[PDB]
Amino acid sequence: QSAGETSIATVGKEGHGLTYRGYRIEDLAANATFEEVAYLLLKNKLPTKSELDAYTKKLVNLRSLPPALKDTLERIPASSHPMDVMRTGCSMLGNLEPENGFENEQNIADRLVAIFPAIQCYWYHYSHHGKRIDTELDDLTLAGYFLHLLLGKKAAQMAIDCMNASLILYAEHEFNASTFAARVCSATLSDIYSAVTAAIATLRGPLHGGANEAAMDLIMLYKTPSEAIAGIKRKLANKELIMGFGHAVYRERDPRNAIIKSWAQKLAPNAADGYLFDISDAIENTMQDEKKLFPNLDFYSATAYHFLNIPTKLFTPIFVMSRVTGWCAHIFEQRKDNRIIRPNADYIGPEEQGWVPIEKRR
Amino acid sequence: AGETSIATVGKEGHGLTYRGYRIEDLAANATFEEVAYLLLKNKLPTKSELDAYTKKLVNLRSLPPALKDTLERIPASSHPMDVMRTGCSMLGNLEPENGFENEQNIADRLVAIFPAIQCYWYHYSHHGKRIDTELDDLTLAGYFLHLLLGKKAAQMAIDCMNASLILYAEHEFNASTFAARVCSATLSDIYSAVTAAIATLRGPLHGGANEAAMDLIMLYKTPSEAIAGIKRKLANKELIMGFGHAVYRERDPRNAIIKSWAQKLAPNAADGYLFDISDAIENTMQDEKKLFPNLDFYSATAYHFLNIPTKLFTPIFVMSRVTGWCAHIFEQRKDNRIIRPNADYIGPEEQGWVPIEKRR
After folding, report:
1. Are residues A153 and A117 in the same domain?
2. Does B230 map to a domain?
3. Is residue A362 part of a domain?
4. Of residues A349, A355, A362, A351, the one with CA closest to residue B27
5. Which chain B residues have a beta carbon less than 8 Å from that of A362?
6. Number of domains in chain B
7. Where is the signal peptide (chain A) (predicted)?
């Protein structure tokens, strides 16, 4: 099912172990900041200390929302889907700060990575609470920044670390519905905001972007592990689809699950509803025992974010905040080797009809 | 890559049908609304059905105040196709689909309102005036020309426009249509899928051929200049917009229809000499490179003779193709199968970790 070529990221040869530009996800999630992996993805190398310092500072000074963008977010209703807010926010920024020539690629990517957390949170707070938040905050890290904008106070260190690792985990994942969309878009020589908007529009779909949101809803149905075992079996006998399990590509394991699971387990003890982790473990055991399926990244991602006090409806915009690095990376690559597979459709419609004038219809 | 019942180019790259009906019979006999109905509702409408539908779209021409507010804040220098992008996306925030049972209500709204989105932006950003979008014109083609130019157009102008919106309505799988399906394949809403198609159609390799053809045509004052100047572009390897096609072999059946309209319009246009320039270019492209003109070539002069500014050619593609797009989105939702794309990895092998202290 070959749609093209990438140097950016890979799942292993016998289906084992993820890498970004050759570096293991286990090493990245353990040892790197998100800024660092955005540098790897966007710039094609691991930054030195100096390079990281400068990059990290460049992004901190790109946290201003243009007046006409605020105007627009203030007019998106509270009831609108948070991913539609991202969609519009990106598109409108593109009207106000157009890419123009492609030599500005990197600067727009950097602007998007820096500002996406503010677009979501400014809309969230204005539309839900009538409050215009200050988005020009001094948080040194992007993980901390988001959590500061969202919760209104600087985050504890363990919270920063978890959020940071989650962003790394969601940054990039080869060809997938949304990254593909971004590449189809770039292959027509469209601007970078078009491509990212297209990808957001594609990620908005619950079969692609919203699995941890559905997994949180599911986990929260149950007070005890037993209830969850029994409730999952009822869903399986009723052939209902449980989100966060199995993957279109991997066949035994999702390398990112272990990392995110480790974090959820770490955050559980200092959480009001830390019992939800054991509910989740019970669900996992039951999906394995019954239909031999393993959890993907989205499953334990649900409890991690929840234990960070992130509202369930805001799970999906965080994927944009991370995966925008990967998208932009794939967009840069399409631009340099612009070949795309032309879609052709098999016709299964009617054969050439004789014209029927309107006076003779029914 | 997938299946469709919506349209096809004929078996050996000849001719074109929408749901079995020939483009020639559609352009000659049908209104755009009638053609939108065929694509969206999957049948040719009766008189009664077409009448109610035509009237339905006339009363879907109001822009919500919030959307106007947003259109007012897009600079005049913003690509008009980025305007359609944000307009579609924002309308989605304002009037969400909320369940696929509302599919048809939203598609009708998009088809009815896209002209107003473009023209309201355009006149505010370029002229500083807030136009009335709730005009009483009975036909969508004539509505767009009235909005754009500030007066009802002549019948010949309405007919041409109508024909052009029919010709652009749908054309199988293509970059833009495929993005609509890819988007729908994840169970995204209708506004997301359309917005993605617009973001894909924004690229000039796909959506801006007629604009590029107008720039080209315009380099030349006389036919003689056209011939020597194309010949210099050909000997320089570079390639000319509006010529050739991936699927068609001998001719693009939409070409003949649009060329006829351009030909009819030339005499009464200030600068109708541009047809003869186009005609000379076409002739040289046959003689030198055996290539035929595609829809986008004489679409250039047709729209130009309709007094459409060249930069505003591309949004017309959206006004027409939204019908095809929506058609494909409905069909994808009913048989939600799509090939999951894999890549061939051409990158580095597994690298050992380097602590930050240790780099360079």
Report:
1. yes
2. yes
3. no
4. A355
5. 46
6. 2
7. none
Three-point CA angle A113, A51, A46, nearest 5°? 75
Residues in A touching B340 (Cβ below 8 Å): 1, 248-249
A54 and A195 within one domain: yes
Give every CB contact of residue A313 below 8 A, 6+ residues apart in sequence: A82, A213
Host H or E run for residue A121:
helix A105-129
Nearest to A35 by CA among A249, A321, A269, A338: A321
My answer on whether B187 and B71 are in the same domain is: yes
Name the minimum distance, in Å, from the CA of B271 to any CA of chain A.
32
CB contact set of B287 (below 8 Å; sequence gap of 6+): none
Q: Which are the contacts of A25, defined by CB distance < 8 A and separation ≥ 6?
A: A17, A18, A19, A168, A169, A255, A256, A259
Q: Which of B47, B84, B182 to mutate to test the interface with A (most CBs of A within 10 A)?
A: B182
Which residues, numbered 250 to 309 in chain B, qualify as contacts with chain A under a Cβ-Cβ cut-off of 8 Å? none
Q: Report the alpha-carbon distance of residue B243 to residue A176 in Å, rounded.
A: 34
CA distances for A18 relative to A8, A14, A121, B344, angstroms: 11, 11, 31, 15
d(CA B124, CA A101): 26
In angstroms, this model's resolution equals: 2.3
The answer to whether residue B353 is domain-embedded is: no
The DSSP string of A227-296 is HHHHHHHHHHHTTPPPTTB--SS-SS--HHHHHHHHHHHHHSTTSTTTHHHHHHHHHHHHHHHHH---B-
Q: What angle do CA B16, B18, B19 make, to 5 degrees?
A: 130
Residues near A262 by Cβ (< 8 Å), separated by ≥ 6?
A: none
**CATH code of residue B273:** 1.10.230.10
Domain end call among A308, A326, A352: A308
In a domain, A351, yes or no: no
- Looking at the structure, tell me whether residues A86 and A141 fall in a common domain: yes
Q: Which two tokens stand for residue A348?
A: 């299964």
- Technique employed here was X-ray
Q: Are residues B240 and B330 in the same domain?
A: no
Marked catalytic residue, from A161, A191, A281, A298? A298
Q: Is A352 on the interface with B (CB under 8 A)?
A: yes
Q: Are residues B214 and B163 in the same domain?
A: no
- The CATH number of residue A314's host domain is 1.10.580.10
Q: Check B202 against A180: CB less than 8 A apart.
A: no
B236 CB-near residues (< 8 Å, 6+ apart): none
* Nearest CB to A348 within list B3, B77, B86: B3
Distance CA A133, CA A152 (A): 9
Q: Do A194 and B202 touch (CB under 8 A)?
A: yes
| Residue from A16, A55, A71, A184 whose CB has the most chain B CBs within 10 Å, to mutate | A184
Q: In chain B, what is the greatest distance between 2 CA atoms, to the nearest angstrom?
A: 77
Residues A241 and A275 in one domain: yes
Query: B6, B16, B93, B95: best mutation site toward chain A, by most A Cβ within 10 Å?
Result: B93
Residue of chain B with shortest Cα separation from A199? B196
Cross-chain Cβ contact A350/B4 below 8 Å? no
Domain that holds residue B336: 1-207+307-342
Do A56 and A73 belong together in one domain? yes
Any CB–CB contact under 8 A between A208 and chain B? yes
